[PDB]
Design a protein around this nucleic acid. Structure first.
Lengths: 204, 120, 257
RNA sequence: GUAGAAACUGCGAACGGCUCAUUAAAACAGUUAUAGUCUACUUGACAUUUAUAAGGAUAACUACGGAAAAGCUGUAGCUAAUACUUGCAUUAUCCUUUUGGAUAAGUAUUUGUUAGAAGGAAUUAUAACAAAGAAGUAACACGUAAAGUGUGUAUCAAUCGAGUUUCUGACCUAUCAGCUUUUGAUGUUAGGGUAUUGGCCUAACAUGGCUAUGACGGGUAACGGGGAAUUAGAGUUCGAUUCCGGAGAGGGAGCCUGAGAAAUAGCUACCACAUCUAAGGAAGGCAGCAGGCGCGUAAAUUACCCAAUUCUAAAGAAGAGAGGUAGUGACAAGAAAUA
């Protein structure tokens, strides 16, 4: 009923609270991930296509992908299952959950717009929001800026001034630790050489 | 007044930059001597220019009076005093003031403040 | 569950630790390391109860935080670190060298040693294992593995170990003239010359050890530590010199003072 | 640079504390074995078949939400890591004889064929040959001598332990004399399974195994021991209860993670109780510390603190009803007024 529609390309979303059932009638008997023409919900929504990505039932129980029922079922939730937050490592807990099929029980419905329509919606397809924070890995920065291995990218970062720190750098300490490890391997080699040498000498 | 100070099992401990010993105060026919007087007496005896570098504890007046046993520590300096000594002893010396006395109500609050139940 | 216990009750602690009954409910369980819990003391009690340098466990931690005390010329910071049967403890701030040894009453004492002697530790080889390449490793009482030992070294020998380089300097056999120190028995702490060795097939081998005053005491083979040859002990000894005395005549020398 | 809410990650939560229901060769104790095994932290050794440094994907966060309610959580968007995942020299040996050429390249584990520092005894260590082959050998973080450390990693060893295991030792009862053996009872063979041995389990086979020296049963107001009371010497009675070992977390059973749990202030289900609910659904386990009801002849404060003892951690600095301190306390014990 409180349809939450997301434009991931525009990084934005909008809520539509509707009460008519014939408006949502084409959505019925559609599993999660199904694409549906969201034209009957409103005049301005004609043209768009919406993928049903989730929702909550009347009592607030979420929906999942696997279960192909129209009601709520209980099942064990594992450490890697999506609708569960374990309280300790390896803990499994039995919880009620609502099937992927949509009926007249959804207190909410999550949808993502996949195909643009013919009209514009204020704040849904007009403005876009950025990453809200830049990438942190040096390879990610290099891919974003396309400057190969020319110069340090520490001065081509994004701030609010105040700027983040970059991982996987080429720092002189990162080079000297590798050098020191190589020398440690070498010196271990020579000591293991002449120690067995003196062992062979004292064998007789 | 007058009294006698006695230092037993004295030993310097550079690891804690301390000097440990045991005190025996002979004050016959008179009451127990306040810690300030023994502080200055020890300062004179060991030639110390400052008096807040010592700590005294475990003072017992024994049976029949006229005697008192205790333990004392001589510190290299006040920085060592603060580094190597506990907060309650510093407060006893008066070198610092009392902190918050909330106590186990902090533990009660921490139990109440379950993570992701208080967003702050 | 029923995993490893991690607490030690005071009365359950080893007797030679000499911890008092009323001084709390727990004893410091020594961390796993070079020596067994029964045949070692944690350095917390070493420098709180023996050296009296620290008055509390927190003061032990205070000492240990600064990398001062070194066990076998290397820095140790664990509070419950097993020091062990014999080895050197160097305190740098006070510049003192100790060797952990046994008194005639079977208790661990830090014996003053010189700087020159603090480089010569003794290790009792417990096993000889040959790994790939016909390379031989000696496993010692210290829990230490020494690769490339001299082929003459046997399973009950001892080896003088240099702490700086971790190398063997010389070895000592177990003839009937090699002086030994007993480590865990009724005669823990005694130093003798080994009168005889009796080797029972399939059971404990017994050895009879002759004292300086010609009194003989027997012990299990696993409870001895070769210290030197007949000439002299290779290490210094505490003031009793490993000479145990009858209790009826310890009293007389106690009284005469 | 100093710090740093939250969150991911790491470690711990398998210790401790409580209680004594079960339990009668079981548990426990002394004494063995593990040549029949596993073992985190810690300690010592020490490795093998783009490189001026590689990949996505996620928490926290932002926005829209649902549910009466819960340590409930959907969708969309991004980002890290010692989270998850890929991946970069060299050494040894033969000979003329410091030196020149020549030859070879898998840690555990499994299979087949052989040779063979120690143990008491080896199908041992180890070595050779022929096959497989895990997991690794730093794409990680801080700084000590007037180069170090942390974190992580294969194997061996040590250590903290554990599982099985040898011999011997227990109260009353025969108005319990024959038990066990289809339903594994005793053993052999082969296998499966386990960390390992084993009827532990499976298939075939044999008919064994225990017993008046008390089997098999029954009772115990029976956890065992260290110990306690009473003792001239013998004895008799007690031991829930400081320590050690065992068992249990209302009764059973099952299971995940993990080095370690058949864990219970972990999960799953049934039985018995029992809480909230808007009636749709959620949530529980005081034989932990206090405290309450009940039961009774019969037993204390809903106190203070981590200062000591000690444990856990990313280990000074935080926690800890472990523990300590005080309160109640004519349980016991000691000294000692009323001249």
């Amino acid at each position: 009923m409180k349809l939450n529609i997301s434009n991931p390309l525009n990084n934005v979303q909008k809520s539509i609270e509707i009460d008519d059932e014939k408006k949502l009638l084409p959505f019925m008997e559609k599993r999660i991930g199904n694409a549906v023409p969201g034209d009957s919900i409103g005049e301005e929504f004609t043209g768009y296509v919406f993928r049903i990505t989730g929702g909550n039932d009347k009592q607030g129980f979420p929906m999942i992908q696997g279960v192909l029922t129209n009601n709520r079922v209980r099942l064990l939730f594992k450490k890697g299952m999506k609708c569960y937050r374990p309280r300790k490592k390896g803990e499994r807990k039995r919880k009620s959950v609502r099937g992927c099929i949509v009926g007249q029980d959804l207190s909410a419905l999550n949808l993502t717009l996949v195909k643009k329509g013919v009209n514009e919606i204020p704040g849904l397809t007009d403005k876009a929001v950025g990453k809200k924070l830049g990438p942190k890995r040096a390879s990610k920065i290099r891919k974003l800026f396309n400057l190969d291995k020319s110069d340090d990218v520490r001065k081509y970062v994004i701030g609010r001034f105040i700027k983040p720190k970059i991982q996987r750098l080429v720092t002189e300490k990162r080079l000297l630790r590798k050098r020191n490890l190589l020398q440690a391997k070498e010196k271990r080699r020579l000591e293991k050489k002449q120690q067995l040498k003196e062992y062979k000498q004292l064998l007789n | 007044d007058q009294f006698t100070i006695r230092v037993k099992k004295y030993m310097s401990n550079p690891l804690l930059r301390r000097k440990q010993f045991a005190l025996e105060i002979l004050h016959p026919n008179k009451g127990s001597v306040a810690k300030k007087e023994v502080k200055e007496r020890l300062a004179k005896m060991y030639k110390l220019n400052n008096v807040n570098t010592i700590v005294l504890f475990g003072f017992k007046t024994l049976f029949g009076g006229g005697r008192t046993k205790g333990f004392g520590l001589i510190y290299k300096n006040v920085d060592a005093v603060k580094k190597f000594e506990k907060k309650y002893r510093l407060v006893r010396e008066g070198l610092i003031d009392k902190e918050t006395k909330a106590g186990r109500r902090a533990s009660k609050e921490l139990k109440n403040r379950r993570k992701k139940v208080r967003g702050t | 569950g029923k995993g490893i216990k991690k607490h030690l009750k005071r009365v359950n602690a080893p007797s030679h630790w000499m911890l008092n009954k009323m001084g709390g409910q727990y004893a410091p369980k020594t961390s796993s390391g070079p020596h067994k819990l029964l045949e070692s003391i944690p350095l917390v009690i070493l420098l709180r109860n023996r050296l009296k340098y620290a008055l509390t466990f927190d003061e032990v931690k205070m000492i240990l935080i600064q990398k001062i005390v070194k066990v076998d010329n290397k820095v140790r910071t664990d509070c419950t670190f097993p020091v062990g049967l014999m080895d050197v403890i160097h305190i740098t701030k006070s510049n003192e060298y100790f060797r952990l040894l046994y008194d005639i009453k079977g208790r661990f004492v830090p014996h003053r040693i010189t700087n020159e002697e603090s480089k010569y530790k003794l290790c009792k080889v417990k096993k000889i294992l040959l790994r790939k390449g016909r390379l031989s490793i000696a496993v010692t009482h210290d829990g230490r593995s020494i690769p490339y030992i001299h082929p003459d070294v046997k399973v009950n020998d001892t080896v003088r170990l240099d702490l700086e380089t971790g190398k063997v300097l010389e070895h000592l056999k177990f003839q009937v003239g090699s002086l030994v120190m007993v480590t865990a028995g009724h005669s823990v702490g005694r130093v003798g010359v080994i009168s005889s060795i009796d080797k029972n097939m399939g059971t404990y081998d017994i050895i009879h050890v002759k004292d300086s005053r010609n009194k003989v005491f027997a012990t299990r083979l696993s409870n001895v530590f070769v210290i030197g040859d007949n000439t002299k002990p290779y290490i210094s000894l505490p003031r009793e010199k490993g000479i145990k005395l009858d209790i009826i005549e310890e009293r007389r020398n106690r009284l005469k003072a």
